[PDB]
Amino acid sequence: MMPTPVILLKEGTDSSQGIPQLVSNISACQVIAEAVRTTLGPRGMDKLIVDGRGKATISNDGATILKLLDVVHPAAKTLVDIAKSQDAEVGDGTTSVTLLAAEFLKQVKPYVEEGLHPQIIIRAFRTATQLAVNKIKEIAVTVKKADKVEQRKLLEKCAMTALSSKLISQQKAFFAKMVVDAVMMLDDLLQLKMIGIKKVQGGALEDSQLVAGVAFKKTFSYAGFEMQPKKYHNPKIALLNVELELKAEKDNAEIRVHTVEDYQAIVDAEWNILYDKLEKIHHSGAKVVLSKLPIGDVATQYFADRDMFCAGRVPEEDLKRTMMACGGSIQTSVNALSADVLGRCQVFEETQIGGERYNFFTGCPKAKTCTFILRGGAEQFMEETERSLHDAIMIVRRAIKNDSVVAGGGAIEMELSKYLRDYSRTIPGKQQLLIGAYAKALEIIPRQLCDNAGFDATNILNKLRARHAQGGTWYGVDINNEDIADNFEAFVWEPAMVRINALTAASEAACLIVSVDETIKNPRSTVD
């Protein structure tokens, strides 16, 4: 070029244009896919990422791994974004989206290299994705019998399939039973905040329990708390948002007196206000008192003298779960403590779990909430158990919304690839190569399963292709037997929407990446 004494853009502006930048973008997407490639399948492995502060995160979740990775490549960020999208909309398949998008891009990289117009590739991807989604909706197996037992079995199988890739896969049936039971007790919105997840260090995975009620950690007891009884057999629970303390009446309040009689009267009036609140709470008939605001030592001793239980500074979400379990109402004022606003549980108890004190509200017959208590040898262990249970819970919620399932293990994608190849063999031909490339890219997931399991991917893929061609829809990778099997009969089930969203997001990401021809990076401002 030329110096051009006065230049157009600010100095340091880096621009890349043409085929080389698109090839570099595809390579970056391949690099991103490599970082999560070995996390897929029952034989998948965990990744450990350490941040600057020195904290380590161990996860089998694709979205979590990608988020912990601090990606700065403009094209590579699209894969992380679609992983987040899949996590948000579905909750499972965050590795499959990245693998599928990267495989699409890798398959169309050669055609890009001869200078094929990107619009043709985008149109081919759009057509192939529409056909694949329609085929998935057409061939997805659904049961229109509304059988409660069959629905429970389907939910349990889906949860097991969603869980048989994590570290809790050994107890996958037991955890899936917990997850299904917990989800079935949510009322109509299946809100995630209505399922408590408590992680307590110590104990094996089999020691983890689901509480048909609500449980939370003991919250900074005051003096005289240890004299309160710690077990009740039909308690009435008073859910309050009240500070039971000896304090100023108001921040701007100010008392002006000119007689010692008025001084004593004011002191006794403050004491009488506190005692009136406490007496109202006591005469409400409640035995267990929980408050969001602090409960003072005076109130603690007052409740201890009456054989009552008190617990202040309870977290707001814990109070909401206690509401949904026992069936009371949080009161900011104690002036009207009727039986309507009082919670009720069969048994309240405080026990010790791994060197911590927890309060239990069990026996609730009409509870709309749950509480998972997770046990493990390390905090990252419990964190990843929570992540796996979150994946299972999201899968079960989606299955509740619509019970349309397809066989896993790559069987659905092998069927889709066969169908797409059959479609591509009957078109003019410029789109035929791209649709065939899409169908071939659809084979990445079973091949990755075989590679992770230590299989021979080529032979398994050939057998799967032959079986699908000769007849058979739900034949996928059998990880245990080094062969293929009818995965529908093996109860390897996934919701159809999981694959639908995965294909849609991967295709959108591939089209967006291909549609870019120039990348411009402005010089950094305020580098500091």
């Binding site: 001869e114 410029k430 190569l433 590679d451 021979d456 991917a457 080529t458």
Partner: protein
């Protein structure tokens, strides 16, 4: 645990790194392939500029650090040394072979199977080329040489002037033809001296029916044109005689000093007189000549050229019939020179070429020699014309030695890809995949050719493959083997009819060298880089 003072890369990391290096080297020169290719412009970080299209020159000038990229660079250098043409094609083919082999390996195909498949595919491709895709030059004639030269000079700075440059190249090559023992006509290229001098246009380049020397006469008093030249070639300096280390002059009688000093020069004077007594007109010597012998030659009206290059002197002596004389000494112990050691030419002149002068030994007898003076507008274009002219001379030499030529413009690669894709089904299970990937990799040449012209590469290559498949399936449409690419219109065309030819040795050697390079790089699965 290993405690090796260095960096270690193992597994797919090093394989991908090697493939990336090879791909980068291929991408550097991929834009200079085919007639619609364009030259590059190298700067030597000191102001030196090089404009070239030759792949070997580009890869030699670049400084390369990665071992695999080096491997490709010396691969191009070897291809240039042993053939002279196809230097870019071999690098591109090797890099594409490496890419597809790495793809197969990443698909968990063992590299040994890929190597065996590549070896089988290379052998079968060479066999198919030799059996189906060769054309004999016996029934073509001089037109085959002209077309081969024109095809070689396409994609070069002398492309449009091919109608003239091909004639010049063919005449120059045929002028230096000699037959050795076994009755084999040999064509000693690099015996055609190439002289570069800016000035008139490229069309004014001259083909000398003789030899051209990049040197002038030593003294302005000598004539600058001799009609009936009797060339005397010498390999010793004509200066004042000085005695060796083992000889020392010690004077005791002072009367002998003058005689000693006079004889010191009288020895050389007698040698000059002996040389000139035979009628010699042109005297060429590799050594220097001082003023005294220059005046001796001036008085006799004879040429005298000093510091003549040894190779130039050898060529002049061989052409003119003169014999190099490193010394004047017969088998009788005397010091004599007879007319038998004199070469003959019918004119020796000193022409002026753009403010400079050079000596032309025109029409030497007893053997015909040739030389080319390239006229351009600056030094860069003259150098590029020299490189392209050398490529054309090498191509013509290959065509004249081996009388087999193959269609150009991607026809050979397309036919090979079709045949190998068909044939792979009859060999093994995974080596079948290796042979199929070899066949697919062979298609990069037409792809790059089409891309460089901004043509529809996909559709054009598909049409080429369809034509070749029809040729190989239907046994009466075998004439479609010659259907290559016509980059002017972006359509398939019968290249044999169009006169687009290449020597078969170019394709054979390029295939063999690219396959061996891909095998060598593919063998690596680990790298240890010790700190310096």
């Amino acid at each position: 645990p290993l405690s090796v003072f260095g960096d270690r890369s193992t597994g797919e990391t090093i394989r991908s790194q090697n493939v990336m290096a090879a791909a980068s080297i291929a991408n550097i020169v991929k834009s200079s392939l085919g007639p619609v290719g364009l030259d590059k412009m190298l700067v030597d970080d000191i102001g030196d500029v090089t404009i070239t299209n030759d792949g070997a020159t580009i890869l030699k000038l670049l400084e390369v650090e990665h071992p695999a990229a080096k491997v490709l660079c010396e691969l191009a250098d070897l291809q240039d040394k042993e053939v002279g043409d196809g230097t870019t094609s071999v690098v591109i083919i090797a890099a594409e072979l490496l890419k597809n082999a790495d793809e197969l390996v990443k698909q968990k195909i063992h590299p040994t199977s890929v190597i065996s498949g590549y070896r089988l595919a290379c052998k079968e491709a060479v066999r198919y080329i030799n059996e189906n895709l060769i054309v004999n030059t016996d029934e073509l004639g001089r037109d085959c040489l002209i077309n081969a030269a024109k095809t070689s000079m396409s994609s070069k700075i002398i492309g449009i002037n091919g109608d003239f440059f091909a004639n010049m190249v063919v005449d120059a090559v045929l002028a230096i033809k000699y037959t050795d023992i076994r009755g084999q006509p040999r064509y000693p290229v690099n015996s055609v001296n190439i002289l570069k001098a800016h000035g008139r246009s490229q069309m004014e380049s001259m083909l000398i029916s003789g030899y051209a020397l990049n040197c002038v006469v030593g003294s302005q008093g000598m004539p600058k044109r001799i009609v009936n030249a009797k060339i005397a070639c010498l390999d010793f300096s004509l200066q004042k005689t000085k005695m060796k280390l083992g000889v020392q002059v010690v004077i005791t009688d002072p009367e002998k000093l003058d005689q000693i000093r006079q004889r010191e020069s009288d020895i050389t004077k007698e040698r000059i007189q002996k040389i000139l007594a035979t009628g010699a007109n042109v005297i060429l010597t590799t050594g220097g000549i001082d003023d005294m012998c220059l005046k001796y030659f001036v008085e006799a009206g004879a040429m005298a050229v000093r510091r003549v290059l040894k190779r130039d002197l050898k060529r002049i002596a061989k052409a003119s019939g003169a014999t190099i004389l490193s010394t004047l000494a017969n088998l009788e112990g005397e010091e004599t020179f007879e007319a038998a050691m004199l070469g003959q030419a019918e004119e020796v002149v000193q022409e002026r070429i753009c403010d400079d002068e050079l000596i032309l030994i025109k029409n030497t007898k007893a053997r015909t020699s040739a030389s080319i003076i390239l006229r351009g507008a600056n030094d860069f274009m003259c150098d590029e014309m020299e490189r392209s002219l050398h490529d054309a001379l090498c191509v013509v030499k290959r065509v004249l030695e081996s009388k087999s030529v193959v269609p150009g413009g991607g026809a050979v690669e397309a036919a090979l890809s079709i045949y190998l894709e068909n044939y792979a089904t009859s060999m093994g299970s995974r080596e079948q995949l290796a042979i199929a990937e070899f066949a697919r990799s062979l298609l990069v040449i037409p792809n790059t050719l089409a891309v460089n012209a901004a043509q529809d590469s996909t559709d054009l290559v598909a049409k080429l493959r369809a034509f070749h498949n029809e040729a190989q399936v239907n046994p009466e449409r075998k004439n479609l083997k010659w259907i290559g690419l016509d980059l002017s219109n972006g359509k398939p065309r019968d290249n044999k009819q169009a006169g687009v030819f290449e020597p078969t040795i170019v394709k054979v050697k390029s295939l063999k060298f690219a396959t061996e390079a891909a095998i060598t790089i593919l063998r690596i699965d680990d790298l240890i880089k010790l700190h310096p």
